[PDB]
Design a protein around this ligand. Structure first.
Ligand SMILES: C[C@H](Nc1ncnc2[nH]cnc12)c1cc2ccc(F)cc2nc1-c1ccccn1
Length: 831
């Protein structure tokens, strides 16, 4: 009580939503989940190694790629250890442990340690340094005190009921406003098990029906996770409002009695359509009034084919995740249940062949899951696992076997999928789920995962009404186990970004170009420096870096329609070898969640390419959405837009020219050596992004949204946005670097083409994994009333089904479409 109340307030501020609030609930599920997440929290806290926890070595067991091997001769890497003033340099082999070479080796500039029983080759920092052509540097330091990571102390059976399910629609009530009807769907996954409508009435501000809607499905046939989905159409109709209610609640009980549900408006696959959350805006939202009536009813717990058929089944099984199953296929999968079970890849389809509205079939399915010996022993396929976690699956036991598989992921692989795994919580029927606990116990076991877990959850709590409650309960559970140092750390991070938000927002209210504002910005910054800015905060998109003093001199504001703040900070770590500022852009008016998702997919593309010894030098800069249309972005040093390079050597904004970009590169390359290093990095980076963006359907890019660094690294930006078209941006100037003009070939255009194809085929070897991630991004991140149309773009993009010849040839057509078109799309912007 004495501490519990100030502590829960610490938690409310950190979360930015009161988890102990019952203003907007009709049951106690949220609270039940708070209580329920205590066990797995306490287990993970109990079993975590204090030493490795506090230092969080960021390691991988991946093989050191072929391209990074070729950046070391005679098998000897150099690590320069720092005493105080002087620094000695030790020669080592990739295999050497940090033991091998009271103290602990910490990275200079960063809270990042080279510790534990892993070879230096396998540390991500060492792998990072090797990549960029940088040398490894560490300070002999005391291991940080584990003490600092201390944690504060803390019926009638359903299957004996043959009645048909029914629900009364008393009426709807809207304070401020055609005819209208209520449709009531019993859903499972996306599957509509059974549907009923009311008679149409006139759409007045209050509409009463008093009718029983009788469903064809029996109570015993209600599956756990079935949503009563209530929707309101008007009229050739149009969906105006929706709400959902779980028919079987957290305790397995059948949901009974009176409900006044506040509904959501509409602006069609969308995670938002699935939430059990009610609209909290009661004074405006549309309400529906229902009665579920029947004593409490509880769901129990569940204590050699023909050649052409097998082949027909092997075809079905092999098809892609977005390939529709006909009933004919469903019937075949289910009849051959046990054959289908021998193939982990058949699982998604197989469990999409189950009649979830039929209780004996569901029991047979669970008997099937009891026997998943092959599943259990198979190699982890994340593509296949993620499929089982999407909106097509609402059965806990099905979904649980996906999570079961995610357990074998090393901490490096979690980070790779964390955002998308945080987003897949939107598909869980219930607040407490095996997926939320996986996230939780994995966040609690590794500070790096823990860090981003916080921010990914906070991103959603701050802007999703459809899921802030759930995600909030989950984040609290993390916060109650992360440890005092992280709490304090988070408190610092939140305070800063809330101060910087103010200034960004306040300046945007004082607004295409600025005069009096440039010192009105610097006024407010100077204020915070000594008003309440902490001397150091952690960089949310890069937790290894603490930022400190503001470089007011360097801070500016874009001459844009959204006045983002360009901010710079001195690094708080005295032992940083450089004094490069830390560069954060703060922006309002774009939805940076969409950016988070594209940047993360890009990172996944890189690690795929890594497994085929392909580096394409992408630049997935950091980006965290922190609130309602607001967030932060990593400033990439020594970087300029392609647009501004054109507007400098050509000047006027009308025309364009080819030489300028190669000319700008030579000017930024001191020696010829580094100029050729750039044209190479440019061919790769151009390749990486041409492939990356064609697949994701975002290649047609205004070229003030493509940037290049002074070492020739091309990189796309500002993905939150999205006259004839172009599959991607490969403009005459890009081609001029590659020594080509109109129609020609060169030792670099042949390489670029070469690379693009390898890059492209390497993505297709993960057709499914990409199809699911893309599928999920759109549903959870791009509320664009996403259709089958939109999702099925990536299939065509990855030319599914085609052999590698036709695929190779397809992409080279695209390369040429761009050649043929030149400046047409770019010039067409200004009109
Ligand atoms: C468009 C460009 N974008 C980025 N620049 C650097 N790092 C980044 N990371 C993601 N986007 C950028 C940019 C953004 C700005 C935002 C605020 C501001 F005050 C100034 C900005 N300036 C640039 C910019 C434009 C042309 C050349 C260099 N920087």
């Amino acid at each position: 009580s004495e501490e519990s109340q100030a502590f829960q307030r610490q938690l409310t501020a950190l979360i930015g939503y009161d988890v102990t609030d019952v203003s907007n609930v009709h049951d106690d599920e949220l609270e039940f989940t708070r209580r329920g997440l205590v066990t797995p929290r306490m287990a993970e806290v109990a079993s975590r190694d204090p030493k490795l926890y506090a230092m969080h070595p960021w390691v991988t067991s991946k093989p050191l790629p072929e391209y990074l091997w070729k950046k070391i001769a005679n098998n000897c890497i150099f690590i320069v250890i720092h005493r105080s003033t002087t620094s000695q340099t030790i020669k080592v082999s990739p295999d050497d442990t940090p033991g091998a070479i009271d103290f602990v080796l910490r990275v200079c500039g960063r809270d990042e340690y080279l510790v534990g029983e892993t070879p230096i080759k396998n540390f991500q920092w060492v792998r990072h340094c090797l990549k960029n052509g940088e040398e490894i540097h560490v300070v002999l330091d005391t291991p940080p005190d584990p003490a600092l990571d201390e944690v504060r102390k803390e019926t009638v059976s359903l299957w004996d009921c043959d009645r048909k399910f029914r629900v009364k629609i008393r009426g709807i009530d809207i304070p401020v406003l055609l005819t209208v009807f209520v449709e009531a769907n019993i859903q499972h996954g996306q599957q509509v098990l059974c549907q009923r409508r009311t008679s149409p009435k006139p759409f007045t501000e209050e509409v009463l029906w008093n009718v029983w809607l009788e469903f064809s499905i029996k109570i015993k046939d209600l599956p756990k996770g079935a949503l009563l989905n209530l929707q309101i159409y008007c009229g050739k109709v149009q969906l105006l409002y929706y709400v959902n209610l779980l028919l079987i609640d957290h305790r397995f009980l059948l949901r009974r009695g009176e409900y006044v549900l506040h509904m959501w408006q509409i602006s069609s696959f969308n995670a938002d359509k699935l939430t059990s959350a009610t609209n909290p805006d009661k004074e405006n939202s549309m309400s529906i009034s229902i009665l579920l009536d029947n004593h409490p009813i509880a769901l129990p717990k569940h204590q050699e084919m023909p050649n052409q058929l097998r082949k027909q089944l092997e075809a079905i099984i092999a098809t892609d995740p977005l390939n529709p199953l006909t009933a004919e296929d469903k019937e075949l999968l289910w009849h051959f249940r046990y054959e289908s079970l021998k193939h982990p890849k058949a699982y998604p389809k197989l469990f999409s062949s189950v009649k979830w509205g039929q209780q004996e079939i569901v029991a047979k399915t669970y008997q099937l899951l009891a026997r998943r010996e092959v599943w259990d022993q198979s190699a982890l396929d994340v593509g296949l696992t993620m499929q089982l976690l999407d909106c097509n699956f609402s059965d806990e036991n099905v979904r649980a076997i996906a999570v079961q598989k995610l357990e074998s992921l090393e901490d490096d692989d979690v980070l790779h999928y964390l955002l998308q795994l945080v987003q897949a919580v939107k598909f869980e029927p219930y607040h407490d789920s095996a997926l939320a606990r996986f996230l939780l116990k994995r966040g609690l076991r590794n500070k790096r995962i823990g860090h981003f877990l916080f921010w990914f959850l906070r991103s959603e709590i701050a802007q999703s009404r459809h899921y802030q409650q759930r995600f909030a309960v989950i984040l609290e559970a993390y916060l109650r186990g992360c440890g005092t140092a992280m709490l304090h750390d988070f408190t610092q991070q939140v305070q800063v970004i809330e101060m910087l938000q103010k200034v960004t927002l306040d300046i945007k209210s004082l607004s295409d170009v600025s005069s009096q504002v440039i010192s009105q910005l610097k006024q407010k910054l100077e204020n915070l420096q000594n008003s309440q800015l902490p001397e150091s905060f952690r960089v949310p998109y890069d937790p290894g870096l603490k930022a400190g003093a503001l470089a007011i001199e360097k801070c500016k504001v874009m001459a844009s329609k959204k006045k983002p703040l360009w901010l710079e900070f001195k690094c708080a770590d005295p032992t940083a070898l450089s004094n490069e500022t830390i560069g954060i852009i703060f922006k309002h008016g774009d939805d940076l969640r969409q950016d988070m998702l594209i940047l993360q997919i890009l990172r996944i593309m890189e690690s795929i390419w890594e497994t085929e010894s392909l580096d394409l030098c992408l630049l997935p800069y950091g980006c965290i959405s922190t609130g309602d249309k607001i967030g932060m972005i990593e400033i990439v040093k020594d970087a300029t837009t392609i647009a501004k390079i054109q507007q400098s050597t050509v000047g006027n904004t009308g025309a364009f020219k080819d030489e300028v970009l190669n000319h700008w590169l030579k000017e930024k390359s001191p020696t010829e050596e580094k100029f050729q290093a750039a044209v190479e990095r440019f061919v790769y980076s151009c390749a990486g992004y041409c492939v990356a963006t064609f697949v994701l359907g975002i290649g047609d890019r205004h070229n003030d949204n493509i940037m290049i660094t002074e070492t020739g690294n091309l990189f796309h930006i500002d993905f939150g946005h999205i006259k004839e078209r172009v599959p991607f941006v490969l403009t005459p100037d890009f081609l001029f670097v590659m020594g080509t003009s109109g129609k020609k070939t060169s030792p670099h255009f042949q390489k670029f083409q070469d690379i693009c194809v390898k890059a492209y085929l390497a993505l297709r070897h993960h057709t499914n994994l990409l199809i699911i991630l893309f599928s999920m991004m759109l549903m959870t991140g791009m509320p664009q009333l996403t259709s089958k149309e939109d999702i099925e773009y990536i299939r065509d993009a990855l030319t599914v089904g085609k052999n590698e010849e036709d695929a190779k040839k397809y992409f080279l057509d695209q390369i040429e479409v761009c050649r043929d078109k030149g400046w047409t799309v770019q010039f067409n912007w200004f009109l």
